[PDB]
Amino acid sequence: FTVSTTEDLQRYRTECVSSLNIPADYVEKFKKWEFPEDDTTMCYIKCVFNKMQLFDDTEGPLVDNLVHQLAHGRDAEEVRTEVLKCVDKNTDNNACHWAFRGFKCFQKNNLSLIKASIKKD
Numbered sequence: 001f002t003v004s005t006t007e008d009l010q011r012y013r014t015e016c017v018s019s020l021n022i023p024a025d026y027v028e029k030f031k032k033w034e035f036p037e038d039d040t041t042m043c044y045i046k047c048v049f050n051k052m053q054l055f056d057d058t059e060g061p062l063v064d065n066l067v068h069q070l071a072h073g074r075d076a077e078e079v080r081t082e083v084l085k086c087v088d089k090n091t092d093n094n095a096c097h098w099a100f101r102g103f104k105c106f107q108k109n110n111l112s113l114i115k116a117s118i119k120k121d
């Protein structure tokens, strides 16, 4: 694993939009950090996390990878504790739902951590 840069993420966005044929109105929403509760959006988030090596469709969230991605300027073990709170089983047998659910969980108390991780260092 190697941490994804801002440039890496910008590429992964356009790749997922192209590969999944995401409509233009969704792209606009994503830009404004608006993620509708629908399968279009959930599969998009899964696609991005796949490319960033933060999520595997079978194994689920890749915890150590997430910690490295998120713990810049923070305590790694504190961040690991927060990540693990959001790690769950693939209850409803849907990788798209699964990836999105962890995303939603982590945003609740760690939004600024997410946003900080995707800005140029």
Ligand SMILES: CCCCC/C=C\C/C=C\CCCCCCCC(=O)O
Pocket: 013, 030, 031, 045, 048, 052, 054, 061, 066, 069, 070, 083, 084, 086, 087, 088, 102, 103, 105, 106, 107, 114, 117, 118
């Ligand atoms: C256990 C679950 C953990 C979930 C952690 C959440 C986020 C992962 C960390 C960094 C990746 C940034 C997400 C980019 C958002 C995609 C939408 C977009 O900007 O186009």
Ligand SMILES: [Co+2]
Pocket: 072, 116, 117, 119, 120, 121
């Ligand atoms: Co950083």
